[PDB]
C-alpha cells in the first residue's frame, strides 16, 4: 500500500499506516497529536508512542533507534508532567507479558540497525497478539486489531516468545509499575568507553593563515571578535567513542525531562518557587508562561563531567547559551580544513536543528533579534538569524536599545517605525529581573515597565515584560536555568546516576566529599568556589554575583586530557539532543574565556 | 476616539481601549481561551488586568456593581479557588494597590455601576485605571486615568469620587484576612418565594395554538399534542431579585463544580468513587485538559423558597427541557401572556448559538439521538442553534444508519465520515457497554464487524471523533461529586450536606438516597428525621452506588411541588424554568410550568 494509507486500527481505535516510502513517490514527517510529538511518519516508534498516549496519556522519551527504548526506565504522564516508573523484562521471564506492554526487538537481521518496537494487544495460552507499524504494509483484515501473532512458550513460570523471523532478537517486554521483581537493572556503561582521548593532525600547515573563509559574513563576524583563532593549538583535537556519544544523547534527553518535571513541581508550590529569589510580582507570569508556552523552548546547553568515573551534570543553561557558532560553524570549517578522518563533528547540524525548532514554534512572521552591543555577540546573533531565516521567518538584528521607542499611545516600536512583538534575546532573563529589584522599595501592582518616557528611553525590561510581546526563550526557562533547582532534582531523583548531591547548606555528606559553591543566578563560572574534603580551596573565581544565594554541589572535578581540563557540553534543541562540544581550560573551572576544543566522534 | 482605539496602558502593560460605540461575536474579548469580558466595558479591563498581572479572574456578572457581591477568585493555571474580601468605602482596611474598586449603580453610573483598578496609593489620594469612563487618549505614558481624593481620619480610609451623584461601595482584596471585611450579602427569603397566578380565560389555549408548520413546534406536538401541562391558564412568578439570585447561584456553583472536578481528576482515591471503568481514567484526564472550555450546556436542579436556595444536582452531561423554557413557553407567553413580566428562558436559542460559535467543534456536526419521537424536538431544537451558528448537521436516530468501510472508518448512511457528534445519549450508557465484557488493553470499541453493526461506544470513544459534551463532564454530572463539594465548601449557603453513608447528622435531619449515576428521579428514597420513608421511586439504577443528601423537600405552591432549574451555556446562566409534581420527587413525567419574572 502507498505511504500514509490507513491499514487499520489497534485496541482503542489507534490508526496504523503504511510507512512504505519509495524512491518513486521535511517537517511534514512529524506526527503530532495536539502539541505532543508522537514520532516520525510512520516508524514503529511513532505508533508505539501514539498508542500509549491515546490510551494511557503517557509517552517515552525521544530515541534514535527503536531498540533503544528497552534501555529507558520511565514514562512521562502528559497531563501533569509527572514521571512514572518503567520496568524491563527479558524474553523468557517469570513476569508475564501483559496486554498493553511494550515489546522491543534488538537491532539485527530483519531489523538490522533500527531494531523494532510493538504493542501486545492480547495474551493467550500459548500465543500473544500484537499491533505494530513499519513491518507490514498491507491493509489488515476488516476489524482485526493486531498485525501479527507470536508463539508463546510457558515453562515452569518462564514466559518466552518466538518471533516469526529467523534472524531477529526479541529483547523483551516493558511494563509500567513499581514492582521491580523479575526486572532488569538500569544499564550503566563501561567507564572506559567514556574516557576522553586526545589526538593530532599532520602539520601540513593547514591553519597557518586565513583558514576561516572571510567571504562568509558569519565567519568574518567570528574573526572580527576572535581573529583566526579557535584555540591555542589548532592541530590538536579530542575524540570520544560512538558509545560515549550515544550515552550523552541518552543522558541529555533524560535530564531534560527531569528538569521540566521539577520546573513544573516548583511552579505548583510557593515554598519552592520562593527559593529562586525571583520578584514575587512575576510569579503569576511564570506560571502562565509555563502553562501556555510549555513546548516553546528553542534551545539550551548542558554542562557535564565525563570519564571513567561516569557521567555527571553540573548545570543546565536553559535560559541563555552561547557556543552555538563554535561547535556549529567554526569547527565544521576546522574539520573541513584539516580533518582527513572518518569521524564527525557532533555539532554538524545545529543550524538545521534550530530551523526545525523555529518552524514548529509559534513565533510570529517577523522576529526582532535583541543582542547587546558586544562585538562578541554579533556572530551568535547572526548565527541564529540564519537559522530563523532558514525557518522562513523575517528578522532585523537590534544592537543595544537605542533603536527602540514608543508611539503616542505607548506601543513598543523599533527604529524603522515597526512594531516589536516577537523577539529572540541574547540577554539573560536575570538582567531584566534586576531592573525590577532596583525599585524594589515601591509598592507596585504590576511589573514596573515603561509604556512611555520623555527621552523615549526604552529598557530591556520595558520589552521582554511587555505582555503582548512574544519572547524566546520563554520566561519559565529561568526556573530550570536557576541553580536553585539542583537541590530539588536531588530531592526528587535522589542518587540518580547523572546527579550530584546538591544543597543550599553545606550539609554533612558534601563535607566528606568536598563541594562547589555556586551562585544560583550566576554563569560563565563567576564566583565559583571549589573546596575539597580536606577543606582546601582548590580554586576561586571572581564575579559580580558574589552577593546572591548559593548552592553546594558535591565535588566532581573536571578530567584533564592532554594538558587541559575538558568539560563536555551537549545541546538541546526543542527538548532533544542537538549536539556536543568540548570546553577546555587550564583550571578546574570553565570560565568565559575558556577555549573551544575540536571534537571528533569515532567508531 | 473611535471604538477600539488604544488610549494607553495600566501598570504591567495592560491596554485601555476606547469603548465608544457611537462610532455580534466580535465583541467578546479573550486572552487565549479564557474570557475577559465585553468590548470594551469596565468589567473587561478590570478582569483582563487581574488575569494578565495575577493570573486570576472573577466570575461572569450582569453589571459591574455586582462584583462587590463576590467572595472568590479563580486562578486559571490551576483552576484553584481564592478567597476575596469586600470592604466598605470608609473602612479601616486601607485600599492597597491592585485592588478592585466597585461603584454601585447610580448617578453617572446609572444602571451599570462601575469598576476600576487602584494603581497607586498616596497619602491624600489614590490613582486608578478604568476603561469605559473615558474615550480619549491618556497623557503620554500615564498609567492611570483618574486621581481620587482619599481622606484619612482615625484609622479609617475614605474616598470621594469626581462625580457628585455616584456611590462608591468599596474595594476588594484577595486575602485570607477577614478583619474589617463585609460578610457575604444574603437575600431575604421573602423575595425567594414562588407565587402562583392565573390568566384571563379568554379561551386562548383551547385549540391549535402551536403553529405546527414550524418543524420544531410541530415536532413537539408529535410527542405531546397541544399540551404543556394540566391547566394552561395558570402560571407562576418570581421576583427579579430571586432571578438575579438564581443567576449568581448558577455562575458560582458552576465554578465550584469544576473546582471539584479538577480535584477529582488529580487524586486517584477520589476518582475511584465514581465507578467509571479504570480503562477510561486516562481519557478522562486528557479530556479535562484539552476540552476544559468545550462544555455547551448543563442543567441545575434547585430547591428555592423562603428557606433559601439549595441545589440538588447539576446535570452537566445529558440536559433536557431546553425546548420547554426555550421555545414552547415563548409561544405560550406570546399566545396568552399580557403582563409586564418575562420568560427567564427566552433568548436560550441564541445563548446556545453563541456557545457553539466559540466551541472548537468541527464544521459538520452529526446529531445523535435515540429513536423516540420524544427526543426529536430536543435534537431539532439543538440543530437549529448549530445552524444559526453556521454548522452543518445531520440527525441520526438510533445507531442503524452508521457503518464502517474497508479500512474501519466510521461513516453515516451516506458514506460521510462521522467526526463531530452532539449526543443526547448519556455517557453512562456508553460506560455500561464497557461493563458488559477480558483484560483489554484499551477501551473495547469496534473498528469492524461482520454485520456492520455499530454501537454507542464504538462512536463516542473513537479517538478522532469530537464529542459534545466532552467526556470530563461525566464527573460533575455524577452524584458522587456531591460529598466532595461539601468537603471543599463546608456549609456553603447553596450546598446540602451529602455523604456516602448516613452519618449522624443526616439521621437527625432526614435524607434522600440517590444513585450516583442515575437520573429523572430514579430510585430516589426520601427518609424523614422521624426515620419514615416519605416517598420512593423505582428505577433502572437500583443496583449502583448511592449517596445520602440531607433532606430538603421542595416547596408546594398551588397544589404542586415546584422545583427550579437553571441552564448553563458556556459556564454561565442561560435561563430558568420550573418543574412541578404531585409528589416531592421530580421525574421524567413531570409537567413544565410557565414561569414569569416580575419587578
Ligand atoms: N450613552 C452612553 C453611556 C455610556 C456609559 N458608560 C459608563 C461606563 C461605566 N462602567 C462600565 O461600562 C461597566 N459596564 C458594565 O457593568 C456592564 C454592562 S453591559 N457589563 C459587562 O461589561 C458584562 C461583562 C460580562 N457580563 C462579563 O461577565 O465580563
Ligand atoms: N560540583 C562540581 N564539582 C567540580 N567542579 C564543578 C562543580 N560545579 C561546577 N564546577 C566547575 O565550575 C564551572 C562553573 O559551574 P557551572 O555549573 O557550569 O556554572 P556556570 O558556568 O553557569 O557559572 C564548571 O564549568 C566546572 O568546571
Ligand atoms: N435532599 C433532598 N431532599 C428532598 N428532595 C430531594 C433531595 N434530593 C433530591 N430530591 C428530589 O428528588 C428529585 C431527584 O433528585 P435529583 O438530585 O434531581 O436527581 P435526578 O433527577 O438526576 O434523579 C429532585 O427533583 C427532588 O424533587
Ligand atoms: Mg557552566
Ligand atoms: Mg551556566
Ligand atoms: Mg439529574
Ligand atoms: Mg434531577
Swiss-Prot record, chain A:
Changing residue 426 to A: 3-fold decrease in GSH affinity, 21-fold decrease in spermidine activity, and 17-fold decrease in synthetase activity. Mg(2+) 2 binds at residues 315, 317. Keywords: ATP-binding, Hydrolase, Ligase, Magnesium, Metal-binding, Multifunctional enzyme, Nucleotide-binding, Oxidation. Induction: Expression level is unaffected by H(2)O(2); however Gsp rapidly accumulates in E.coli in the presence of H(2)O(2). Residues 1-180 are annotated as: Gsp amidase. Disruption phenotype: Cells lacking this gene do not produce Gsp under anaerobic conditions. Cells lacking both this gene and glutaredoxin (grxA or grxB) become hypersensitive to H(2)O(2); they are even more susceptible to oxidative damage than the single mutant lacking glutaredoxin only. It catalyses: spermidine + glutathione + ATP = glutathionylspermidine + ADP + phosphate + H(+); glutathionylspermidine + H2O = spermidine + glutathione. The active site is at 44 (s-(gamma-glutamyl-cysteinyl-glycyl)-cysteine intermediate). The modification Cysteine sulfenic acid (-SOH) is found at residue 44. NCBIfam families: PRK10507.1 (NF007801). This is Bifunctional glutathionylspermidine synthetase/amidase. It comes from Escherichia coli (strain K12). The lineage of its organism: Bacteria, Pseudomonadati, Pseudomonadota, Gammaproteobacteria, Enterobacterales. The gene is gss.
Amino acid at each position: 500500500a502507498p505511504f500514509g494509507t490507513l491499514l487499520g486500527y489497534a485496541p482503542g481505535g489507534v490508526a496504523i499506516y503504511s510507512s512504505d516510502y519509495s524512491s518513486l513517490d521535511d517537517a511534514v514527517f512529524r506526527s503530532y497529536i495536539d502539541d505532543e510529538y508522537m514520532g516520525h511518519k510512520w516508524q514503529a516508534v511513532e505508533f508505539a508512542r501514539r498508542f500509549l498516549f491515546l490510551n494511557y496519556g503517557v509517552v517515552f522519551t525521544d530515541v534514535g533507534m527503536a531498540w533503544e527504548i528497552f534501555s529507558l526506565r520511565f514514562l512521562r504522564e502528559v497531563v501533569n508532567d509527572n514521571i512514572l516508573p518503567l520496568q524491563a523484562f527479558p524474553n523468557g521471564s517469570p513476569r508475564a507479558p501483559v496486554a498493553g506492554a511494550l515489546l522491543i526487538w534488538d537491532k539485527g537481521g530483519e531489523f538490522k540497525d533500527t531494531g523494532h518496537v510493538a504493542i501486545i494487544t492480547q495474551l493467550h495460552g500459548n500465543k500473544v497478539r500484537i499491533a505494530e507499524q513499519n513491518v507490514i504494509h498491507s491493509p489488515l483484515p476488516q476489524g482485526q486489531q493486531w498485525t501479527r501473532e507470536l508463539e508463546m512458550v510457558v515453562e515452569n513460570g518462564c514466559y518466552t516468545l518466538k518471533d516469526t523471523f529467523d534472524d531477529t532478537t526479541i529483547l523483551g517486554w516493558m511494563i509500567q509499575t513499581e514492582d521491580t521483581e523479575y526486572s532488569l537493572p538500569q544499564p550503566e556503561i563501561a567507564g572506559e568507553l567514556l574516557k576522553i582521548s586526545g589526538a593530532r593532525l599532520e602539520n601540513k600547515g593547514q591553519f597557518d593563515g586565513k583558514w576561516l573563509d572571510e567571504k562568509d559574513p558569519l565567519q568574518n563576524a567570528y574573526v572580527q571578535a576572535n581573529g583566526q583563532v579557535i584555540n591555542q593549538d589548532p592541530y590538536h583535537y579530542y575524540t570520544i567513542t560512538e558509545s560515549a556519544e550515544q550515552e550523552l544523547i541518552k543522558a541529555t534527553n533524560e535530564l531534560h525531562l527531569m528538569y521540566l518535571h521539577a520546573t513544573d513541581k516548583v511552579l505548583k508550590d510557593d515554598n519552592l518557587l520562593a527559593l529562586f529569589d525571583i520578584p514575587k510580582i512575576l510569579w503569576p507570569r511564570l506560571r502562565l508562561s509555563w502553562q501556555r508556552r510549555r513546548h516553546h523552548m528553542i534551545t539550551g546547553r548542558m554542562d557535564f563531567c565525563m570519564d571513567e568515573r561516569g557521567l555527571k551534570v553540573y548545570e543546565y543553561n536553559a535560559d541563555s547559551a552561547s557556543c552555538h557558532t563554535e561547535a556549529g560553524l567554526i569547527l565544521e570549517r576546522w574539520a573541513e580544513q584539516g580533518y582527513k578522518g572518518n569521524g564527525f563533528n557532533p555539532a554538524e547540524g545545529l543550524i538545521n536543528e534550530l530551523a526545525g525548532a523555529w518552524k514548529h514554534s509559534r513565533a510570529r512572521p517577523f522576529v526582532h533579534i535583541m543582542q547587546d552591543k558586544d562585538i562578541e555577540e554579533n556572530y551568535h546573533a547572526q548565527f541564529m538569524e540564519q537559522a530563523l531565516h532558514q525557518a522562513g521567518f523575517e528578522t532585523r538584528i537590534l544592537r543595544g536599545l537605542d533603536e527602540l521607542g514608543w508611539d503616542a499611545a505607548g506601543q513598543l516600536i523599533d527604529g524603522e517605525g515597526r512594531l516589536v512583538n516577537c523577539v529572540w534575546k541574547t540577554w539573560a532573563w536575570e538582567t531584566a529581573f534586576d531592573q525590577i529589584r532596583e525599585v524594589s522599595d515601591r509598592e507596585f501592582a504590576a511589573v514596573p515597565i515603561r509604556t512611555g518616557h520623555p527621552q523615549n528611553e526604552v529598557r530591556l525590561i520595558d520589552v521582554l515584560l511587555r505582555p503582548e510581546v512574544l519572547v524566546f526563550e520563554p520566561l519559565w526557562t529561568v526556573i530550570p536555568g536557576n541553580k536553585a533547582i539542583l537541590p530539588i532534582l536531588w530531592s526528587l531523583f535522589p542518587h540518580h546516576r547523572y546527579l550530584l548531591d546538591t544543597d543550599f547548606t553545606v550539609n554533612d555528606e558534601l563535607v566528606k566529599t568536598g563541594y562547589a559553591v555556586k551562585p544560583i543566578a550566576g554563569r560563565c563560572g563567576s564566583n565559583i568556589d571549589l573546596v575539597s574534603h580536606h577543606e582546601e580551596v582548590l580554586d576561586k573565581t571572581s564575579g559580580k554575583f558574589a552577593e546572591q544565594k548559593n548552592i553546594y554541589q558535591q565535588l566532581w572535578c573536571l578530567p584533564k586530557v592532554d594538558g587541559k581540563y575538558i568539560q563536555v557540553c551537549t545541546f538541546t534543541v526543542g527538548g532533544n539532543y542537538g549536539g556536543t562540544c568540548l570546553r577546555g581550560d587550564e583550571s578546574l573551572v570553565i570560565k568565559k574565556e575558556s577555549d573551544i576544543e575540536p571534537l571528533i566522534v569515532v567508531k
